[PDB]
Ligand binder design. Sequence first.
Ligand SMILES: Nc1nc2c(ncn2[C@@H]2O[C@H](COP(=O)(O)OP(=O)(O)OP(O)(O)=S)[C@@H](O)[C@H]2O)c(=O)[nH]1
Ligand SMILES: [Mg+2]
Length: 182
Amino acid sequence: EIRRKLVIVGDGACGKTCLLIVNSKGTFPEVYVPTVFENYVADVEVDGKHVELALWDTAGQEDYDRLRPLSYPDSHVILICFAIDSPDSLDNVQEKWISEVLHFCQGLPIILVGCKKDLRHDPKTIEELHKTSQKPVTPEQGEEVRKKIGAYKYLECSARTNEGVREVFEAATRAALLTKTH
Ligand SMILES: Nc1nc2c(ncn2[C@@H]2O[C@H](COP(=O)(O)OP(=O)(O)OP(O)(O)=S)[C@@H](O)[C@H]2O)c(=O)[nH]1
Ligand SMILES: [Mg+2]
């Protein structure tokens, strides 16, 4: 039995829990419950190998800054997430999340994950951001941040539509199988 540990971090409401549950359970949560700390598990098949990937969900809320790092030890891959309909959430990837991850997870592969990809072209979302002179995050913007934080890959996904959800955890599992070779 091959076992690896994934930890997902990023701003509150950036869409971490919905990504984990859609990958592992296969249904979008009908109701929104802010996370404190939860652990899931998913069978991931990449390159003929079956990996039991432990999904360590964390609190994006800054009120839970203190106890969040208890999730990090013995991690094999880190997903730092942001919401594509929130440029501010991509800022916090650089301003908060990379500093924390690097304090506790020296030498790990990081996948930068743009969540809520379905909201980029959402006419409702575009109109609402345009009111505050904001635009949804572009793939080029995520690509530059990926490069600046030294993230291995940048992947865009939508838990809502299940677009690019599998590609996130397949890349994460491959990365985790390199981090530890036993
Ligand atoms: N449109 C869209 N909405 C999403 C998606 N994923 C999550 N959401 C919405 O965003 C909100 C936050 O979802 P959630 O996954 O709980 O964020 P989180 O990062 O876990 O939030 P927290 O526990 O750190 S406070 C919810 O209202 C949910 O419906 C997505 O892929 N597309
Ligand atoms: Mg959550």
